[PDB]
């Protein structure tokens, strides 16, 4: 037993840094809001990439590629990865539908990894970074 | 918030606190997270780094003279850990 | 679960997990917490100590052969920090 | 900006380590539970005392001295204290009234110090350790 | 000697220093390796203590039972960190 | 009294990292040694630069330039610097003269600053990394 | 590889803590000097014993029972021990022969382990605390 034990972070890859932008059901998007979202994504994309992550970005505007993306992340093997990161990004001052749809997505995204449902991530860090406002 | 083992849940704001609106530069939480990631990410332990993000963000204020609407309020982030070990992101060999 | 600035919420079991029943020695989470307070309380940063408790408790097993109904069950604690600095309990 | 900054823990006292036991409306309480509760309270009491804490214990059995204890902790000063600890201990597989009562007690206990509603703890660590179902 | 001095020696008394190779010397290689990874975070005497291990475990002439054992002497009064400057 | 007290490293600059190479009085300098010495200076220059240091290199081959270089370093104010670093580098196998000159040079370099002559470095870490044999 | 790697300290015993008083060839021992040395010995004995060490104290006055003591400690197995501590204590402003005997005693005490010819302490920390002038 060892108080300074660290997670083993010496696998071939770091892992996927998934970045999800919650965009659907949000109207009256101001210019500062639009370029801030792009600022947050780009900033997150740079910083995680430099730490060895393979950044994957997508949104919920289409819905076709949403399901195609959600099932892709479900079936991905992380056997050669150190960890997994998922950033959920959304706007403040959202309407009732927007906020509610956020919680469903957050429950779903993390629902895919709860109670060790992804066997290649067992014993490996699963970091979830959530920016939301009701 | 059903989360299993080896999870680390990082929140931009706790309950009963305010989130500063999106600017051209982005958001407070993500700016500071990213400033810290870029400065300490490859050296410090990650929960230590997120504690710095808790501080930086929670110390952020706004010009109360221009906008005295948002006065006496701050953004206080939070994180929940079910990690069993220290977490470092040292450069991969 | 409304908290505040400089709060540290330490939980004995995360949601979706099982808590081992009380014995004559106490409970798994408090025993381990106390063991780590005894050995590392004066020196370790407290969240690092709490991370050890997440490890010790999450690795505890019952004799599954004696009780096969317990198979699959484990206790995984959690903590939630709104601390803005490192926390040490150095001797005063 | 110091990435190794630590809470200032140089006050005259460490502070109170409150140990609360949720006992009321529990009508089973076997031999292991009975003595296990005493073992946890004892173990906790020794470890926190060794870290300089002023350990205070009570339960919700007597409603009269419950409110008086709740009121005293609400009003006592922490200005010469480093931090504050509060430990909430409740039994397992209690009845539905027992479990619901626990949620209300936890919210109230944490609510006494919530936001920054206790001034002599502003900028000081507030540690809540919770065991429940 | 002096107050707040730190003397980092490549080889201690009664021990042999390795030959200079094309890739540099053992001491500096390992020192520089640790600085690269641990320099911005770790306390510098902890970092020096790592170099003591790293160089003492290195091995290469019938004198076999032989290692370079570095040494540091601290008259530091506080912890030394090289956290990234603003 | 803080048992985890750190040096105040919050000045404008980190400070000078002096990389000195002892070359004079060494005869029959092998190519590999020339490469290794370059590798050490280069590696040291890269690692200290990334830690914020203003790295300055020089050797003792030329008699005049040495006196000018030591003079330059003797009259630098370290008021806005966190610390001082000096690395003495010398070749492994060298003649009795070479090894003697190293000793006299090391005492000269540490003789400066020592006690507390350099007042701008008073209370600040002074780090000497010495590779002699 | 780990920068937080610690020495193994889970052996049966903590190990011997030798406390040596250099006394012989000191001819004018004042009251503060006498009591101070006792105060230092007692204080060291208390602190190391509470750390689990086995404190063995002796001096060099009686040369007959000294030689036996050196052999007593030189033949010991530290296999079941975490580490080894040795404290050398001598007086200040002593005479010429007193200072010389100190150096020889220190080189002899340290030499008993310095060649790595105490095999049972190999890989284990050997701590020497030295008070002399």
PDB file of N, CA, C and O in Angstrom, chain C residues 89 92, chain D residues 9-19 48-56 76-86 120-121 124-125:
ATOM      1  N   UNK C  89      -3.070  19.342   7.755  1.00  0.00           N
ATOM      2  CA  UNK C  89      -3.254  19.381   9.198  1.00  0.00           C
ATOM      3  C   UNK C  89      -1.914  19.104   9.870  1.00  0.00           C
ATOM      4  O   UNK C  89      -1.719  18.061  10.501  1.00  0.00           O
ATOM      5  N   UNK C  92       0.095  21.467  15.491  1.00  0.00           N
ATOM      6  CA  UNK C  92       0.093  22.860  15.944  1.00  0.00           C
ATOM      7  C   UNK C  92       1.099  23.068  17.068  1.00  0.00           C
ATOM      8  O   UNK C  92       1.217  22.229  17.966  1.00  0.00           O
TER       9      UNK C  92
ATOM     10  N   UNK D   9      -3.421  27.657   8.293  1.00  0.00           N
ATOM     11  CA  UNK D   9      -3.888  26.870   9.430  1.00  0.00           C
ATOM     12  C   UNK D   9      -3.064  27.212  10.678  1.00  0.00           C
ATOM     13  O   UNK D   9      -2.573  26.324  11.380  1.00  0.00           O
ATOM     14  N   UNK D  10      -2.935  28.508  10.958  1.00  0.00           N
ATOM     15  CA  UNK D  10      -2.081  28.996  12.046  1.00  0.00           C
ATOM     16  C   UNK D  10      -2.864  29.713  13.149  1.00  0.00           C
ATOM     17  O   UNK D  10      -2.306  30.532  13.879  1.00  0.00           O
ATOM     18  N   UNK D  11      -4.147  29.395  13.280  1.00  0.00           N
ATOM     19  CA  UNK D  11      -4.976  30.006  14.316  1.00  0.00           C
ATOM     20  C   UNK D  11      -4.719  29.297  15.643  1.00  0.00           C
ATOM     21  O   UNK D  11      -4.115  28.227  15.670  1.00  0.00           O
ATOM     22  N   UNK D  12      -5.170  29.897  16.740  1.00  0.00           N
ATOM     23  CA  UNK D  12      -4.951  29.335  18.079  1.00  0.00           C
ATOM     24  C   UNK D  12      -5.517  27.921  18.219  1.00  0.00           C
ATOM     25  O   UNK D  12      -4.908  27.073  18.872  1.00  0.00           O
ATOM     26  N   UNK D  13      -6.677  27.683  17.605  1.00  0.00           N
ATOM     27  CA  UNK D  13      -7.333  26.369  17.622  1.00  0.00           C
ATOM     28  C   UNK D  13      -7.486  25.787  16.216  1.00  0.00           C
ATOM     29  O   UNK D  13      -7.543  26.524  15.225  1.00  0.00           O
ATOM     30  N   UNK D  14      -7.556  24.460  16.147  1.00  0.00           N
ATOM     31  CA  UNK D  14      -7.916  23.752  14.919  1.00  0.00           C
ATOM     32  C   UNK D  14      -9.388  23.999  14.597  1.00  0.00           C
ATOM     33  O   UNK D  14      -9.739  24.325  13.465  1.00  0.00           O
ATOM     34  N   UNK D  15     -10.240  23.834  15.605  1.00  0.00           N
ATOM     35  CA  UNK D  15     -11.683  24.004  15.456  1.00  0.00           C
ATOM     36  C   UNK D  15     -12.446  22.797  15.967  1.00  0.00           C
ATOM     37  O   UNK D  15     -11.853  21.800  16.392  1.00  0.00           O
ATOM     38  N   UNK D  16     -13.769  22.893  15.920  1.00  0.00           N
ATOM     39  CA  UNK D  16     -14.641  21.815  16.368  1.00  0.00           C
ATOM     40  C   UNK D  16     -14.729  20.708  15.314  1.00  0.00           C
ATOM     41  O   UNK D  16     -14.840  20.983  14.120  1.00  0.00           O
ATOM     42  N   UNK D  17     -14.652  19.461  15.771  1.00  0.00           N
ATOM     43  CA  UNK D  17     -14.977  18.302  14.950  1.00  0.00           C
ATOM     44  C   UNK D  17     -16.286  17.728  15.479  1.00  0.00           C
ATOM     45  O   UNK D  17     -16.287  16.948  16.429  1.00  0.00           O
ATOM     46  N   UNK D  18     -17.395  18.138  14.870  1.00  0.00           N
ATOM     47  CA  UNK D  18     -18.726  17.700  15.288  1.00  0.00           C
ATOM     48  C   UNK D  18     -19.012  16.283  14.785  1.00  0.00           C
ATOM     49  O   UNK D  18     -18.906  16.013  13.589  1.00  0.00           O
ATOM     50  N   UNK D  19     -19.369  15.381  15.696  1.00  0.00           N
ATOM     51  CA  UNK D  19     -19.794  14.031  15.321  1.00  0.00           C
ATOM     52  C   UNK D  19     -21.284  13.856  15.633  1.00  0.00           C
ATOM     53  O   UNK D  19     -21.679  13.771  16.791  1.00  0.00           O
ATOM     54  N   UNK D  48      -9.367  12.539  15.180  1.00  0.00           N
ATOM     55  CA  UNK D  48      -9.503  13.993  15.086  1.00  0.00           C
ATOM     56  C   UNK D  48      -8.874  14.722  16.268  1.00  0.00           C
ATOM     57  O   UNK D  48      -8.274  15.780  16.086  1.00  0.00           O
ATOM     58  N   UNK D  49      -8.990  14.160  17.468  1.00  0.00           N
ATOM     59  CA  UNK D  49      -8.298  14.722  18.631  1.00  0.00           C
ATOM     60  C   UNK D  49      -6.785  14.761  18.413  1.00  0.00           C
ATOM     61  O   UNK D  49      -6.129  15.735  18.774  1.00  0.00           O
ATOM     62  N   UNK D  50      -6.239  13.705  17.814  1.00  0.00           N
ATOM     63  CA  UNK D  50      -4.808  13.647  17.524  1.00  0.00           C
ATOM     64  C   UNK D  50      -4.380  14.707  16.499  1.00  0.00           C
ATOM     65  O   UNK D  50      -3.209  15.083  16.458  1.00  0.00           O
ATOM     66  N   UNK D  51      -5.326  15.190  15.692  1.00  0.00           N
ATOM     67  CA  UNK D  51      -5.078  16.295  14.757  1.00  0.00           C
ATOM     68  C   UNK D  51      -5.429  17.668  15.356  1.00  0.00           C
ATOM     69  O   UNK D  51      -5.474  18.668  14.638  1.00  0.00           O
ATOM     70  N   UNK D  52      -5.681  17.711  16.661  1.00  0.00           N
ATOM     71  CA  UNK D  52      -5.881  18.972  17.372  1.00  0.00           C
ATOM     72  C   UNK D  52      -7.316  19.452  17.470  1.00  0.00           C
ATOM     73  O   UNK D  52      -7.562  20.548  17.976  1.00  0.00           O
ATOM     74  N   UNK D  53      -8.269  18.646  17.004  1.00  0.00           N
ATOM     75  CA  UNK D  53      -9.682  19.048  16.998  1.00  0.00           C
ATOM     76  C   UNK D  53     -10.338  18.967  18.376  1.00  0.00           C
ATOM     77  O   UNK D  53      -9.943  18.173  19.233  1.00  0.00           O
ATOM     78  N   UNK D  54     -11.357  19.802  18.562  1.00  0.00           N
ATOM     79  CA  UNK D  54     -12.181  19.797  19.762  1.00  0.00           C
ATOM     80  C   UNK D  54     -13.470  19.014  19.461  1.00  0.00           C
ATOM     81  O   UNK D  54     -14.426  19.561  18.905  1.00  0.00           O
ATOM     82  N   UNK D  55     -13.486  17.732  19.822  1.00  0.00           N
ATOM     83  CA  UNK D  55     -14.569  16.830  19.408  1.00  0.00           C
ATOM     84  C   UNK D  55     -15.849  17.025  20.227  1.00  0.00           C
ATOM     85  O   UNK D  55     -15.815  17.050  21.455  1.00  0.00           O
ATOM     86  N   UNK D  56     -16.971  17.166  19.524  1.00  0.00           N
ATOM     87  CA  UNK D  56     -18.284  17.363  20.135  1.00  0.00           C
ATOM     88  C   UNK D  56     -19.256  16.338  19.565  1.00  0.00           C
ATOM     89  O   UNK D  56     -19.365  16.205  18.346  1.00  0.00           O
ATOM     90  N   UNK D  76     -21.884  29.587  17.917  1.00  0.00           N
ATOM     91  CA  UNK D  76     -20.517  29.586  18.458  1.00  0.00           C
ATOM     92  C   UNK D  76     -19.513  30.137  17.445  1.00  0.00           C
ATOM     93  O   UNK D  76     -19.661  29.938  16.239  1.00  0.00           O
ATOM     94  N   UNK D  77     -18.497  30.830  17.954  1.00  0.00           N
ATOM     95  CA  UNK D  77     -17.514  31.531  17.125  1.00  0.00           C
ATOM     96  C   UNK D  77     -16.363  30.622  16.694  1.00  0.00           C
ATOM     97  O   UNK D  77     -15.890  29.795  17.477  1.00  0.00           O
ATOM     98  N   UNK D  78     -15.920  30.796  15.448  1.00  0.00           N
ATOM     99  CA  UNK D  78     -14.793  30.046  14.881  1.00  0.00           C
ATOM    100  C   UNK D  78     -13.619  30.962  14.520  1.00  0.00           C
ATOM    101  O   UNK D  78     -12.724  30.558  13.779  1.00  0.00           O
ATOM    102  N   UNK D  79     -13.616  32.186  15.045  1.00  0.00           N
ATOM    103  CA  UNK D  79     -12.642  33.205  14.642  1.00  0.00           C
ATOM    104  C   UNK D  79     -11.204  32.857  15.035  1.00  0.00           C
ATOM    105  O   UNK D  79     -10.255  33.325  14.404  1.00  0.00           O
ATOM    106  N   UNK D  80     -11.047  32.044  16.076  1.00  0.00           N
ATOM    107  CA  UNK D  80      -9.734  31.542  16.480  1.00  0.00           C
ATOM    108  C   UNK D  80      -9.508  30.110  15.984  1.00  0.00           C
ATOM    109  O   UNK D  80      -8.634  29.407  16.494  1.00  0.00           O
ATOM    110  N   UNK D  81     -10.284  29.691  14.981  1.00  0.00           N
ATOM    111  CA  UNK D  81     -10.238  28.318  14.470  1.00  0.00           C
ATOM    112  C   UNK D  81      -9.669  28.260  13.050  1.00  0.00           C
ATOM    113  O   UNK D  81      -9.860  29.181  12.257  1.00  0.00           O
ATOM    114  N   UNK D  82      -8.966  27.168  12.753  1.00  0.00           N
ATOM    115  CA  UNK D  82      -8.445  26.906  11.413  1.00  0.00           C
ATOM    116  C   UNK D  82      -9.568  26.513  10.465  1.00  0.00           C
ATOM    117  O   UNK D  82      -9.767  27.145   9.428  1.00  0.00           O
ATOM    118  N   UNK D  83     -10.297  25.462  10.835  1.00  0.00           N
ATOM    119  CA  UNK D  83     -11.311  24.864   9.974  1.00  0.00           C
ATOM    120  C   UNK D  83     -12.517  24.417  10.789  1.00  0.00           C
ATOM    121  O   UNK D  83     -12.607  24.702  11.982  1.00  0.00           O
ATOM    122  N   UNK D  84     -13.452  23.733  10.136  1.00  0.00           N
ATOM    123  CA  UNK D  84     -14.579  23.112  10.818  1.00  0.00           C
ATOM    124  C   UNK D  84     -14.870  21.757  10.196  1.00  0.00           C
ATOM    125  O   UNK D  84     -14.947  21.637   8.977  1.00  0.00           O
ATOM    126  N   UNK D  85     -15.032  20.744  11.043  1.00  0.00           N
ATOM    127  CA  UNK D  85     -15.414  19.410  10.597  1.00  0.00           C
ATOM    128  C   UNK D  85     -16.753  19.016  11.211  1.00  0.00           C
ATOM    129  O   UNK D  85     -17.036  19.334  12.371  1.00  0.00           O
ATOM    130  N   UNK D  86     -17.573  18.339  10.411  1.00  0.00           N
ATOM    131  CA  UNK D  86     -18.852  17.799  10.851  1.00  0.00           C
ATOM    132  C   UNK D  86     -19.015  16.427  10.225  1.00  0.00           C
ATOM    133  O   UNK D  86     -18.886  16.280   9.008  1.00  0.00           O
ATOM    134  N   UNK D 120     -17.454  33.735  10.725  1.00  0.00           N
ATOM    135  CA  UNK D 120     -16.143  33.373  11.272  1.00  0.00           C
ATOM    136  C   UNK D 120     -15.512  32.137  10.610  1.00  0.00           C
ATOM    137  O   UNK D 120     -14.421  31.720  11.009  1.00  0.00           O
ATOM    138  N   UNK D 121     -16.187  31.552   9.615  1.00  0.00           N
ATOM    139  CA  UNK D 121     -15.601  30.483   8.798  1.00  0.00           C
ATOM    140  C   UNK D 121     -15.360  30.902   7.342  1.00  0.00           C
ATOM    141  O   UNK D 121     -14.947  30.087   6.523  1.00  0.00           O
ATOM    142  N   UNK D 124     -12.388  29.616   5.235  1.00  0.00           N
ATOM    143  CA  UNK D 124     -11.814  28.505   5.994  1.00  0.00           C
ATOM    144  C   UNK D 124     -12.432  27.189   5.534  1.00  0.00           C
ATOM    145  O   UNK D 124     -13.601  27.160   5.133  1.00  0.00           O
ATOM    146  N   UNK D 125     -11.649  26.095   5.578  1.00  0.00           N
ATOM    147  CA  UNK D 125     -12.173  24.813   5.116  1.00  0.00           C
ATOM    148  C   UNK D 125     -13.354  24.324   5.946  1.00  0.00           C
ATOM    149  O   UNK D 125     -13.302  24.358   7.171  1.00  0.00           O
TER     150      UNK D 125
END
